[PDB]
């Protein structure tokens, strides 16, 4: 819905034990890509993309997993690992496309599915995040960051979630909210009410 | 209705209904409570203007397109607001009476997907500063805000390129995306909001 209809060009396929999501960076000077350990089959997957496909190997810290892919001729977008304790708005590089979202203290919202695991989290300049993990199916999120810490799908406050997006107050209206959310207010910026009821 | 609109209207929307039927926004400027919309909205000089437990014929100073006037017996929500600068690009909202809906305020142009009955709807940066008051469209994302000296933005092409400094996101491909008449088509990746954006739009 908010979701492109194409992933990005540095998004990629990741076929293990399971099919998931993850992207190509350039990261100190080295092509990398990055994913999620648990789709991996044991420490490999096959990593599949437009003019790609090739098996790779990943160091793994919890459910972070990161390689070396020095065969990627395609665009590989310097990125660096965001300080620890960032927050603000990011981007879900899934197979089946970028998909905005929130990282918050020990949180992180987003609407994503099956098949979006491994995904990277960048934010809007571009910096990695980590990559998602998982969720609740209402936009709860679970984040995975290079050292392996995460953020669970705990209670927030629907106050809180508002700080990150922009936009006029406006009424929920019938908009159906997400059972991890403490509903604080019935009104909220544009921006994020036009995000719920897309949702 | 639009593309990423809201069900609802932003608090201080209104309805205003002089020759046509139009929206409009409540603000506190000066200090003091008042509305503006778009003048050729208006009977003259006034329009019938509503909102939840307010309905009250107003008359208009008007500019140009502009229109503004006093309503102090408005018991809602209305926002300070001051003018914001000469040269002011960025993200805005159109505060329209059918749900409010982001946009780019830039260099020249205006670009947000309105449809009829928007005329009027406040335009406001992030920030909540007055731009000025949407007047019009081609239908295609390409408007005409209204400032309040009357100074007005026309649907000039724009490259593709342009549009996308606005927008946040990885780039990615334009797939089925068609873009919009006014837009001259400079690249064939887009940062993912923008993408989003332009693929909400309906047939």
Redesign the interface.
Known sequence: A?????????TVNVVGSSMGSGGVFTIDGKIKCVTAAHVLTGNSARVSGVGFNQMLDFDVKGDFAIADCPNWQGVA?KAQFCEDGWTG?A?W?TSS??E?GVIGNGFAFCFTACGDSGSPV?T?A?ELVGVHTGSNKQGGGIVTRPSGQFCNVKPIKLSELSEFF??????L???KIGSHIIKDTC?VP??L??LL?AK
Do not use: H, M, W
Request: glycine share 12%.
């Open positions: 908010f979701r492109t209809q194409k992933p990005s060009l540095n977008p708005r981007y590089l496309g970028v905005p960048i809007e571009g922009a936009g006029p107050k406006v009424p209206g019938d908009v009104e544009s921006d009410c036009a009821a």
